[PDB]
Amino acid sequence: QSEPELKLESVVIVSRHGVRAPTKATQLMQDVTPDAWPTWPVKLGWLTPRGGELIAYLGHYQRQRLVADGLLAKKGCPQSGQVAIIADVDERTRKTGEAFAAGLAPDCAITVHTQTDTSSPDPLFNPLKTGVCQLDNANVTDAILSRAGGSIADFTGHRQTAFRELERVLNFPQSNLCLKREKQDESCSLTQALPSELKVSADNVSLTGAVSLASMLTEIFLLQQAQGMPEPGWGRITDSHQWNTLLSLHNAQFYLLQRTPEVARSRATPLLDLIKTALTPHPPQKQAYGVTLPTSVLFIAGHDTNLANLGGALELNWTLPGQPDNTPPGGELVFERWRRLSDNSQWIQVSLVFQTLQQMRDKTPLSLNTPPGEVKLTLAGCEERNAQGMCSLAGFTQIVNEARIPACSL
Ligand SMILES: [Hg+2]
C-alpha cells in the first residue's frame, strides 16, 4: 500500500455561525414589498434549531474526516487539550460552537470559550468596533470607490438585472415605496428610490440605500430557503439561476465592504494572529480565552464578515458550487498544517468547506460518503508551494506578517 507523503498535524477552522432567524423587518422592508414577511420558529437574531443541526452535521463530518486523517481518534472523547472551541459573544456563535462540538464528539463536554464579558464585543472578531484601531478614512474611501468602478452608481448600474430580479421577487411595483411614489413621473426602481452612499468613519464602513438593503434581503431569502420554509420569497424564487442572480447583490456588497484590503487587513488582524500562532508548532502556550495553543483542532465561531475579511487579507478568492452565498452559514475556512515526512518540512493548506444550499434545504446529514462541498484555495501571494499546491509554513507566515496591521493586533 502506498503511504501518504504528507501528515496532517494541525487544523484551524474559522466558521460562520449557522442559520439564524433574521431581525425584525424594518419599516423599509415592508415598503419595498406589498407582501408580509414570514415569521421564524425561534427568537429573531438567534440560531434556529435547524441551524444547529446543520452545524452539528459539519461537526460529524469533520470528526470522520480528521479520524481518517489520523488526527482524531475514532473512539472516545478527544484527549484533554486536543480540541478547542472559541466563539464570538453573540448567541448565534456561542450556539454554533456548541452544535459543532456536539457533532464532532456527542455527549462529550467540550467547552465553548468566549470573552469573559458577554455584554461587550470581542475585539478578536472586529478590532475596529472596540477602538483597538482605526480605519484611514480617505484611503478606505478611495480603495472602495476604486473597486466599485469609480462610483456606486456605475456599480449598481452594472447590476440592474439582479436588482430588477429582486424587485420581481418583492413585487416592488405594487409596493408602498413604489405606489405612494412622489415622482410618478419615472418608473419604479429600487436603486433610484434609494440612492446608495458610501459612509466611512474610523470604526466602520457602510453603504446606504438599495445596495445594503439588497444585500440583506437576498441573504434573508437564502436563510428562508436554508431554514426549510415553504416558499422563500413568496414562492417567487424558482431556479438556481434566480438564486445566483439574487445573491450576487449580497456577494457584491461584501466584495466592497468586507474584502477590500484597506478594510479587510485591519478587521482580520486579530484573527490572522490567532490562526498563525495556532498553526505554528510551539508548546501549548496561550493567546487568550483560557485556551491553550497550539493544539490539534481549533474551532472558531465567527461571522461571514470574518470569512470575507480573511479572504481579502490573504488574497483568497472562491466561488462555491451549489452555494450562491460566498460566505454561507456554517461555511468554514479551513487552515491545515501538513508535515512532509520526507524532509519533515511544514506546509499549510487552505480550504472553504460548505454545505450546498440544497444540502441545507434538505437538511441532509453529512459523512465521508456524502460530504459537504469543498473548495481548495490558493494563496495568491504564496510563491513557495509544494506538489500538492500548499504554501510552506514560512511563506504563509510571511503572508500573514505583511497583511496584518500591527496597530490592530490584540
Ligand atoms: Hg474558557
Matching residue, cell 456605475? 154
Q: Is 154 a catalytic residue?
A: no
Furthest CA-CA distance within the chain:
76
| Residue from 239, 304, 343, 362 carrying the catalytic annotation | 304
> How many alpha carbons lie under 13 Å from residue 215 in its C-beta half-sphere?
21
Alpha-carbon gap, residue 11 to 332, rounded angstroms: 12
Rounded to the nearest angstrom, the distance between the alpha carbon of 106 and the centre of ligand 1 is 19
Backbone angles phi, psi at 177, to 5 degrees: -55, -35
Distances (CA, A) of 195 to 33, 166, 256, 352: 18, 16, 16, 34
Q: Select from 253, 258, 219 the least CA-distant residue to 148.
A: 253
Backbone angles phi, psi at 297, to 5 degrees: -130, 135
Residue 64 has a CB neighbour count (10 Å cut-off) of 18
Alpha-carbon gap, residue 46 to 21, rounded angstroms: 6
Rounded to the nearest angstrom, the distance between the alpha carbon of 67 and the centre of ligand 1 is 25
| Residue from 17, 60, 122, 325 carrying the catalytic annotation | 17
Task: State the method.
Answer: X-ray
Rounded to the nearest angstrom, the distance between the alpha carbon of 115 and the centre of ligand 1 is 8
- With the C-alpha atoms ordered 400, 306, 15, 88, is the resulting torsion angle positive or negative? positive
HEC sequence for the chain: CCCCCEEEEEEEEEEECCCECCCCCCHHHHHCCCCCCCCCCCCCCCECHHHHHHHHHHHHHHHHHHHHCCCCCCCCCCCCCCEEEEECCCHHHHHHHHHHHHHHCCCCCCCEECCCCCCCCCHHHCCCCCCCCCCCHHHHHHHHHHHCCCCHHHHHHCCHHHHHHHHHHHCHHHCHHHHCCCCCCCCCCHHHHCCCCEEECCCCEEECHHHHHHHHHHHHHHHHHHHCCCCCCCCCCCCHHHHHHHHHHHHHHHHHHCCCHHHHHHHHHHHHHHHHHHHCCCCCEEEECCEEECCCEEEEEECHHHHHHHHHHHCCCCCECCECCCCCCCCEEEEEEEEECCCCEEEEEEEEEECCHHHHHCCCCCCCCCCCEEEEECCCCCCCECCCCCEEHHHHHHHHHHHCCHHHCC
Q: What residues have CB less than 8 Å from 60, skipping those under 6 apart?
A: 103, 104, 365, 366, 367
The dihedral over CA atoms of 351, 355, 358, 360, expressed in degrees to the nearest 10, equals -160
- With the C-alpha atoms ordered 337, 341, 346, 352, is the resulting torsion angle positive or negative? negative
Round to the nearest angstrom and report the end-to-end CA distance of the chain: 47
330, 354 in Cβ contact below 8 A? yes
**Breakpoints of the chain, after residues (C–N > 2.5 Å):** none
Distances (CA, A) of 9 to 46, 82, 120, 149, 173: 34, 11, 34, 43, 57
372, 366 in Cβ contact below 8 A? yes
Q: Which domains does the chain have, with CATH numbers?
A: 1-134+259-410 (3.40.50.1240), 135-258 (3.40.50.1240)
The dihedral over CA atoms of 126, 127, 128, 134, expressed in degrees to the nearest 10, equals -150
Matching residue, cell 423599509? 28
The annotated binding site is made up of: 16, 20-24, 92, 267, 303-305
Rounded to the nearest angstrom, the distance between the alpha carbon of 303 and the centre of ligand 1 is 20
Q: What residues have CB less than 8 Å from 37, skipping those under 6 apart?
A: 25, 29, 30, 220
State the resolution, in angstroms.
Answer: 2.2
Is beta strand 391-392 parallel, antiparallel or unpaired with respect to 345-354? antiparallel
Q: Is 325 a catalytic residue?
A: no
Rounded to the nearest angstrom, the distance between the alpha carbon of 274 and the centre of ligand 1 is 16
Alpha-carbon gap, residue 278 to 407, rounded angstroms: 21
The annotated binding site for 1D-myo-inositol hexakisphosphate is made up of: 16, 20-24, 92, 267, 303-305
Crossing angle for the helix pair 304-314 and 240-257, to the nearest 10 degrees = 70
Alpha-carbon gap, residue 52 to 99, rounded angstroms: 5
